[PDB]
Amino acid sequence: AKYVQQKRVNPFFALTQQWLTEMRNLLSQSLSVRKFMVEILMEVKKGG
């Protein structure tokens, strides 16, 4: 809701909660995916 009000995300492409639950289940089970997105977070955090 916060990003929709900021107009950063177009709400037309909104995935259903059925798909989000399936993806979240995959994200929790697998550590390899988590490590990749954590690595992205650290690199993006570094400014410059």
Cα angle 34, 32, 40 (rounded to 5 degrees) comes to 50
Q: At closest approach, how far in Å is the CB of 8 from RNA?
A: 10
41 binds RNA (CB under 7 A): no
29 binds RNA (CB under 7 A): no
Q: At closest approach, how far in Å is the CB of 17 from RNA?
A: 16
Phi, psi of 47 (to 5 degrees): -75, 180
Question: Which residues contact residue 27 at a Cβ distance below 8 angstroms, ignoring those fewer than 6 apart?
Answer: 33, 34
Kindly tell me which residue out of 1, 15, 42, 44 binds RNA, with binding defined by CB under 7 A.
1
Point out which residues bind RNA (CB under 7 A): 1-2, 5-6
